[PDB]
Amino acid sequence: MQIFVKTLTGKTITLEVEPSDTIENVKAKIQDKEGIPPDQQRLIFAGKQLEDGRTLSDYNIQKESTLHLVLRLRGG
């Protein structure tokens, strides 16, 4: 299925995912498509950050849902 991922510039990218994807695997797919390491990615739905070890299914995220991607340089 396809989902949308909106960025802080308003750019929306389309990503092919499965409901069975962990959020970590969604970030790996963003890394494959766009070259950004998962450690630099914050994924947001309903205004609250998604947890790496849950799935899109666990959030009831469906085809053409729109997530938010915020980039951050890794923590110290």
UniProtKB/Swiss-Prot annotation:
The modification ADP-ribosylglycine is found at G76. Changing S65E: Phosphomimetic mutant that binds and activates PRKN. Phosphorylated at Ser-65 by PINK1 during mitophagy. Phosphorylated ubiquitin specifically binds and activates parkin (PRKN), triggering mitophagy. Phosphorylation does not affect E1-mediated E2 charging of ubiquitin but affects discharging of E2 enzymes to form polyubiquitin chains. It also affects deubiquitination by deubiquitinase enzymes such as USP30. Mono-ADP-ribosylated at the C-terminus by PARP9, a component of the PPAR9-DTX3L complex. ADP-ribosylation requires processing by E1 and E2 enzymes and prevents ubiquitin conjugation to substrates such as histones. Changing R74G: No effect on ADP-ribosylation. The chain holds residues 1 to 76 of 229 of the full protein. It is a peripheral membrane protein. It comes from the Eukaryota. It is found in: Cytoplasm; Nucleus; Mitochondrion outer membrane. The record marks H68 as: Essential for function. Residues 1-76 form the Ubiquitin-like domain. The lineage of its organism: Eukaryota, Metazoa, Chordata, Craniata, Vertebrata. The gene is UBB. The modification Phosphoserine is found at S65. There is a cross-link at K6, K11, K27, K29, K33, K48, K63 (Glycyl lysine isopeptide (Lys-Gly) (interchain with G-Cter in ubiquitin)). The modification (Microbial infection) ADP-ribosylthreonine is found at T66. The record marks R54, R72 as: Interacts with activating enzyme. Exists either covalently attached to another protein, or free (unanchored). When covalently bound, it is conjugated to target proteins via an isopeptide bond either as a monomer (monoubiquitin), a polymer linked via different Lys residues of the ubiquitin (polyubiquitin chains) or a linear polymer linked via the initiator Met of the ubiquitin (linear polyubiquitin chains). This is Ubiquitin. There is a cross-link at G76 (Glycyl lysine isopeptide (Gly-Lys) (interchain with K-? in acceptor proteins)).
